Amino acid sequence: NTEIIKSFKNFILEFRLDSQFIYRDQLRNNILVKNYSLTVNMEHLIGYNEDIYKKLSDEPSDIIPLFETAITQVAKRISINSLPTFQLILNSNANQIPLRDLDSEHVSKIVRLSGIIISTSVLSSRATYLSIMCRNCRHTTSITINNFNTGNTVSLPRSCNCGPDPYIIIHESSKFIDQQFLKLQEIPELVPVGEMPRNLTMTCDRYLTNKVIPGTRVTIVGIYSIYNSKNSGVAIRTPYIKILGIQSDVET
Amino acid sequence: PNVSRTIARELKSFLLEYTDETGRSVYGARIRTLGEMNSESLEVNYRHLAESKAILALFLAKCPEEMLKIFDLVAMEATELHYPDYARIHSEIHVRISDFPTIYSLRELRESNLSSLVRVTGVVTRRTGVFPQLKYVKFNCLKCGSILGPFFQDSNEEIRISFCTNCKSKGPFRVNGEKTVYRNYQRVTLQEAPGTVPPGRLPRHREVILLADLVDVSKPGEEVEVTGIYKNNYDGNLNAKNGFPVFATIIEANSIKRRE
Amino acid sequence: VDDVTGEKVREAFEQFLEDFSVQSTDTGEVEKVYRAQIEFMKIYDLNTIYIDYQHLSMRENGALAMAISEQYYRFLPFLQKGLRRVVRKYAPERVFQISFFNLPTVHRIRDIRSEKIGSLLSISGTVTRTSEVRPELYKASFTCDMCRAIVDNVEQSFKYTEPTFCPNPSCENRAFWTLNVTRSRFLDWQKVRIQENANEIPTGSMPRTLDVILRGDSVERAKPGDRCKFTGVEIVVPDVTQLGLPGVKPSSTGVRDLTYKISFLACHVISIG
């Protein structure tokens, strides 16, 4: 929350291999083309410091939206008006977890896996920064959501008494992003001799949409998270993988 | 009761000092097979316990819902004298009681077999997917802090634990997705075997809950032998039938054997 | 009033089974067969009796059975208390059900009319579409906001409600319908659909049916497709699903209309035919 930005803000400025340093040359060449992202190799985090990756491996849902605001304070040291929140795309290679053995222990942990993509969906809209006004008080405000944990985790407040939820979203001043909703099937060479091949459903953020055609072999690095819609049991949730960084092969 | 501390020290001698057939105590050579498969499941026979102490054999059929908690809590400190660094690998063992011949095929289930260890065979019909369960209700109270201590709603009950006078008054609580221990879940139904049917009558279904170790042990079409318990599930039991207070009955499974 | 004549049918029935109703001596049925029917259930403990209907009406010459044939529903509180005063003078975890048989008449499905509600009668029919065996509540222990969970009395009816008087806390009648399974005595019943016999009816025009409740120790004695005779009671059940053919259904001035239909209750089933 505090000062973990500065422990990451020094990582982008000062990481350096033998002669030419990478994350101030990958951040500059992705602004002139107007690409607005960054690609962190995850082996270079733990070579520079181990205490940073200790926080990121334990509780990733609350720290990656802190690194996204640690980039957009550095891109104002290079460009000098509209610079949005940057997106963090990461990739690594530790050990593949097969799709069959995903226990109840891997809830909110960085997990990579593999498989074949069955289907896609149509794009959508999620809100990032919206503007609210009350109906009676007409007291304007601005809620900026940046975290992503699909239904509702951050909603409207109840007072600025007035009525039950007096708040209106104003559609004339906001910003929006995209979502994609894939599906992923395990590779048939890890044969289910008495089973059918299972599947999972992922989500994708603004810069990974429309990247992969149905029918390919991918490797996917994401957060194994959970959501509780009723769209069949008591206190039952459902699993899904929030993708942050799809490392496909050569498409061939 | 508070007589449980007399129970804890005196079944511990039947994990260490029960020997048979010229040495090689079978529950000293069993905990060494934990760890090397790392599986949090002690096998315990019923004939190997009933021949020694006939008191505790009665206290399995009477009320195993409170008996098996004490039989699990001391089961940790049996392994701890072998593997002292075992607090961090699942931190929990549950037990696997073997044969107890109560019910013949499927249909002997009256009131007189309620809340008791029942053993029953059958045939798996169909099964759902694998899901997580809560197991640790952690509030989202706005007046208190959002850690708030571990509270347990671990049943088919969905406890109505209201938050009243938390920090200064009744803070409104929800659930978060933070730091709780989920566990697996899979409902699989079961019907009567086609070999031992009475003439003319259709077979009968029953719903069986598996929990946290025994998921993906069935396959549709197997002669499975369930040794579960038998309870009285609420939470939507015949919602359109309030003139007949008729309750739903689900077997919670405690072991699974294949065909023999 | 009804407390008075309710004890009169109680004390007559208590005096009935203490005496003998069987005359033929030296070839069975000697000296108060109902005392001998008790001790056989004292060894085996299946908690029932199987008493004759004619043998009740032979002693008083129908002075008692005509009320039991008519106002049968009101007397099962008073017949159960009368039997329990007997066995506690005889025998030392108990419930009791009183089954009758050996009726003179057999009625049919088409002769079912609502002048015989709460009465006793028999019916013959064909069994179709049996169901599963499930528990029913019949006695609750509903707690309150204070720690006194004392609830062994009121609201054992066909409504799944909890009580109103005798408050455990200092409050009034709070929220209801709680059933704490630590102390509640369930019995078992199943639901079957009887259909009229084929070789009685006229030209085939979909003969009418009923749904019959089998309480107590009569479960899984009805085979799928055989003829049977049954016991007398004919209850009516509140339901919600009846709509589309409206009449004049009286309202309740929480608003709720009342829709009623016919359902049969039994205590002893015999598989003749």
Domains of chain C: residue spans and CATH: 1-105 (3.30.1640.10), 106-136+184-237+261-273 (2.40.50.140)
Q: Nearest CA to B194 among B170, B167, B159, B223?
A: B223
CA distance to partner chain B, nearest, from residue A252 (Å):
35
The technique by which this structure was obtained is cryo-EM
> In angstroms, rounded to a whole number, what is the distance separating the alpha carbons of residues C49 and A92?
78
> In angstroms, rounded to a whole number, what is the distance separating the alpha carbons of residues C126 and C146?
52
Chain breaks in chain B (C to N over 2.5 A) after: none
Residues of C in contact with B248 (CB under 8 A): 134
> In angstroms, rounded to a whole number, what is the distance separating the alpha carbons of residues B100 and B105?
14
Q: Which long-range contacts (CB under 8 A, 24 or more apart) does A133-139 make?
A: A133/A167, A133/A168, A133/A170, A134/A160, A134/A162, A134/A166, A134/A167, A134/A168, A135/A166, A135/A168, A136/A162, A136/A163, A136/A166, A137/A162, A137/A166
Q: Residue B104's beta-bridge partner residues?
A: none
Q: Contact, C155 vs C161, CB < 8 A?
A: yes
Count of Cβ atoms closer than 10 Å to residue A221 Cβ: 21
Subunit partners of chain C (3 or more CB pairs within 8 A): B
Q: Contact, B83 vs B135, CB < 8 A?
A: no
What distance lies between CA C9 and its chain's CA centroid?
Answer: 18
Residues of B in contact with C211 (CB under 8 A): none
Burial of C205 (0-12, 13-18, 19+ CB in 10 A): exposed
Query: Which amino acid makes up residue A197?
Result: P
Residue B90: both structure tokens together? 């699942």
> In angstroms, rounded to a whole number, what is the distance separating the alpha carbons of residues A162 and A141?
16
> In angstroms, rounded to a whole number, what is the distance separating the alpha carbons of residues A25 and A35?
13
Q: How many CA atoms lie within 13 A of A246 on its CB side?
A: 27
> In angstroms, rounded to a whole number, what is the distance separating the alpha carbons of residues A26 and A40?
10
Q: Nearest CA to B225 among B80, B145, B122, B104?
A: B122
Class of domain B1-102: alpha beta
Count of Cβ atoms closer than 10 Å to residue B149 Cβ: 8
CA distance to partner chain B, nearest, from residue A194 (Å):
7
Q: Which residues contact A133 (CB under 8 A, 6 or more apart)?
A: A139, A140, A141, A167, A168, A170
Residues of A in contact with B156 (CB under 8 A): 234
Residue of C nearest to B63 (CA): C182
Q: Residue B205's beta-bridge partner residues?
A: B191
Q: Nearest CA to C55 among C77, C36, C76, C32?
A: C32
Angle of helix C33-44 relative to helix C2-18, nearest 10 degrees, comes to: 90
Query: Which amino acid makes up residue C211?
Result: D
> In angstroms, rounded to a whole number, what is the distance separating the alpha carbons of residues A211 and A137?
46
> In angstroms, rounded to a whole number, what is the distance separating the alpha carbons of residues B251 and B117?
10
> In angstroms, rounded to a whole number, what is the distance separating the alpha carbons of residues C108 and C196?
8
Q: Residue A218's beta-bridge partner residues?
A: A115, A248
Residues of B in contact with C132 (CB under 8 A): 204-205
Residue A112: both structure tokens together? 């990579």
Place of tokens 């079912």: C112
Angle at B187 between CA B184 and CA B189, to 5 degrees: 155
Residues of A in contact with B183 (CB under 8 A): 104
Q: What is the DSSP string of C235-269?
A: EEEEES---SS-------------EEEEEEEES--
Q: Contact, C71 vs C86, CB < 8 A?
A: no
Subunit partners of chain B (3 or more CB pairs within 8 A): A, C
Return residues 163-182 of C near B (CB < 8 Å): 179, 181
Q: Nearest CA to C40 among C50, C31, C54, C55?
A: C50
Residue A89: both structure tokens together? 């795309």
Chain breaks in chain A (C to N over 2.5 A) after: 80, 149, 160, 231
Interface contact B92, partner A, CB < 8 A:
no
Question: Chains B, A in contact: 3+ Cβ pairs under 8 A?
Answer: yes
Domain boundaries, chain B: 1-102, 103-132+184-260, 133-183
Query: Which amino acid makes up residue A55?
Result: K
Place of tokens 């982008």: A12
Q: Nearest CA to C96 among C159, C31, C48, C39?
A: C48
Residue of A nearest to B137 (CA): A235
Q: Contact, B131 vs A233, CB < 8 A?
A: yes
Distances in whole angstroms, Cα of residue C91 to Cα of each of B106, C11, C38, C79, C83: 34, 19, 9, 18, 12
> In angstroms, rounded to a whole number, what is the distance separating the alpha carbons of residues A86 and A64?
11
Residues of C in contact with B111 (CB under 8 A): 135, 186-188
Test mutation, C97, C132, C256, chain B, max B CBs within 10 A: C132
| B247–C160 CB contact, under 8 Å | no
Interface contact C258, partner B, CB < 8 A:
no
Distances in whole angstroms, Cα of residue C262 to Cα of each of C89, C136, C210, C225, C265: 40, 20, 8, 22, 10
Residue C97: both structure tokens together? 């059900």
Q: Contact, B100 vs B46, CB < 8 A?
A: yes
Q: Nearest CA to A150 among A240, A87, A56?
A: A240
Considering only CB atoms, A107 lies closest to which of B129, B158, B182, namely B182
| B249–C188 CB contact, under 8 Å | no
The most distant pair of C-alpha atoms in chain A lies apart, rounded to whole Å, by 65
Residue B151: both structure tokens together? 């509270």
Phi, psi of A242 (to 5 degrees): -80, 105
Q: What is the DSSP string of C147-216?
A: S-----SS--STT-----SS-SSSS-S-------TTS---EEEEEEEEE--GGG--S-S---EEEEEEES
